[PDB]
Ligand binder design. Structure first.
Ligand SMILES: *[C@@H]1O[C@H](CO[C@@H]2O[C@@H](C)[C@@H](O)[C@@H](O)[C@@H]2O)[C@@H](O[C@@H]2O[C@H](CO)[C@@H](O[C@@H]3O[C@H](CO[C@H]4O[C@H](CO)[C@@H](O)[C@H](O)[C@@H]4O[C@@H]4O[C@H](CO)[C@@H](O)[C@H](O)[C@H]4NC(C)=O)[C@@H](O)[C@H](O[C@H]4O[C@H](CO)[C@@H](O)[C@H](O)[C@@H]4O[C@@H]4O[C@H](CO)[C@@H](O)[C@H](O)[C@H]4NC(C)=O)[C@@H]3O)[C@H](O)[C@H]2NC(C)=O)[C@H](O)[C@H]1NC(C)=O
Ligand SMILES: *[C@@H]1O[C@H](CO)[C@@H](O[C@@H]2O[C@H](CO)[C@@H](O[C@@H]3O[C@H](CO[C@H]4O[C@H](CO)[C@@H](O)[C@H](O)[C@@H]4O[C@@H]4O[C@H](CO)[C@@H](O)[C@H](O)[C@H]4NC(C)=O)[C@@H](O)[C@H](O[C@H]4O[C@H](CO)[C@@H](O)[C@H](O)[C@@H]4O)[C@@H]3O)[C@H](O)[C@H]2NC(C)=O)[C@H](O)[C@H]1NC(C)=O
Lengths: 212, 212
């Protein structure tokens, strides 16, 4: 029988009015015997009519996949509106409903702290620039690095982790290899910046800088 | 029909011979109508007869949960042996098999670095003692904090994260509230320690100290 998966917008997309946040309802395991799929969409229980539904796509396992995309208004998402996708198909005993929304709770502002490498780390093949981001809610967030106005690509960021007070934290690590131009910038006292995007920040953005 | 899930031992359990590492086979969605479940266990395909089955727990959705627990030898697990669980039941077309073993590849030693709070963090409601653990493989690891040989429990540790070189890293964060005896110890210069257990460390253990 078919199955439905409902995906939220990307965190960057709801925070910048220039971007296009979307909720996406995906139906898989749609059969040949009953290939017709109907979508209904609701926002806080009220039906909306502006989703864009793609034609069905046959998969190599001889089932169909069908996708419907609803554009959301940035402030609706951030105001906690609920998005429901209802999927109808003759092979179902009844329609499948799925709902998604921003996690419930009072938003909380991230605190951002940059930490330089341990002195001991200079003996290894690289050093780590650390960005601690704590105290935030909900867990939807974006974290990036840059230096001299240009993005730094060699970084990895932990998932958010639930803290003992109900907020989240994470850490982001920018690697600076022993022999690299990035290492020479760090050595020269060049400034690196940890950038954070979150609904509870002013202008949804803050940067914290780090240098030797 | 029911479903089967198979779980590895806790990382700490395989690294100390005094502890009892276990592989656990969990059966979900077992009905009243066909309630009987059988287990067979195999190690590198060889039937072993020393597993023990727990009595079952009925779930709030009117299904049952059933489990079998097998004790393993620390060195069997660390040497990559394969553990197979076979589940039999009248409601299934054929028995279900699931297999598990330690991640494959050359173990790599964690490198451990303690980082003190950002000067900026002293303005907030707490400070964070940070432990960066990088360069380790496989991702199985345990991390704890202590001070004066006594455990410190107000900490959270991120999951392991895959780094760009195929090793893992994580961070562990020990919270030190603005007003607390633990803050008074940190202020006074007491040493706090990040303890790490991993198969590739000498004696499976290392500690790194941090003080003001
Ligand atoms: C027939 O084939 C298709 C595959 O299509 C293609 O063709 C075949 C022939 C092969 O070549 C395939 O390799 C090929 O892909 C099969 O369709 C698949 O069906 C499975 C289910 O059987 C679906 O699994 C779900 O996957 C989602 C994650 O999906 C995103 O990421 C995938 C990569 O990991 C990606 O492939 C998908 O397209 C997908 O969508 C995109 O994701 C990107 C990020 O990569 C995102 O940016 C995009 O926005 C998004 N796309 C769009 C258009 O927006 C996963 O989330 C699901 O897990 C949930 O459900 C599980 C139960 O099924 C559950 O165990 C999980 O824990 C999780 O559920 C959690 O708990 C509840 C819900 O239970 C919920 O509250 C929680 O929030 C939830 N999550 C957590 C964290 O707790 C699930 O694994 C595949 O997506 C789907 N593939 C495609 C392409 O649609 C089909 O199965 C085949 N049929 C047969 C019979 O063989
Ligand atoms: C009636 O209610 C029941 C309970 O609410 C339902 O049972 C649940 O059914 C779902 C889906 O059928 C199972 O989901 C799987 O969980 C696996 C992980 O389970 C571990 O972690 C969960 C989450 O915390 C925990 O509840 C489990 O008990 C289990 O770990 C135990 O606890 C700790 C935590 O890790 C662990 O250290 C212990 O070792 C272990 N306990 C013991 C005794 O050893 C996932 O790995 C599964 O992933 C599969 O499917 C994915 C599909 O996306 C895929 O990505 C994966 O590769 C993999 O194939 C899967 O998500 C729940 O485990 C199960 N709950 C319990 C308690 O068993 C029941 O379904 C419901 N009935 C109906 C009809 O709905």
């Amino acid at each position: 029988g078919p199955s439905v998966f409902l995906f939220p917008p990307k965190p960057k997309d709801t925070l910048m009015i220039s971007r296009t946040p979307e909720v996406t309802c995906v139906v898989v395991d749609v059969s040949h015997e009953d290939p017709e799929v109907k979508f209904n969409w609701y926002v806080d229980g009220v039906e909306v009519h502006n989703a864009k539904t793609k034609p069905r796509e046959e998969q190599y396992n001889s089932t169909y996949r069908v996708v419907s995309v609803l554009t959301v208004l940035h402030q609706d998402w951030l105001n906690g509106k609920e998005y429901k996708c209802k999927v109808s198909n003759k092979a179902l005993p009844a329609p499948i409903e799925k709902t998604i929304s921003k996690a419930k709770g009072q938003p909380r502002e991230p605190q951002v702290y940059t930490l330089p490498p341990s002195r001991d780390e200079y003996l290894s093949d690289s050093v780590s620039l650390t960005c601690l981001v704590k105290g935030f809610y909900p867990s939807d967030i974006a974290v990036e690095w840059e230096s001299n106005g240009q993005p730094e690509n060699n970084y990895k960021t932990t998932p958010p982790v639930l803290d003992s007070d109900g907020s989240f934290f994470l850490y982001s690590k920018l690697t600076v290899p022993r022999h690299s131009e990035t290492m020479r910038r760090w050595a020269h006292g060049n400034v690196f910046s940890c950038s954070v995007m979150h609904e509870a920040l002013h202008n949804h953005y803050t940067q914290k800088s780090l240098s030797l």
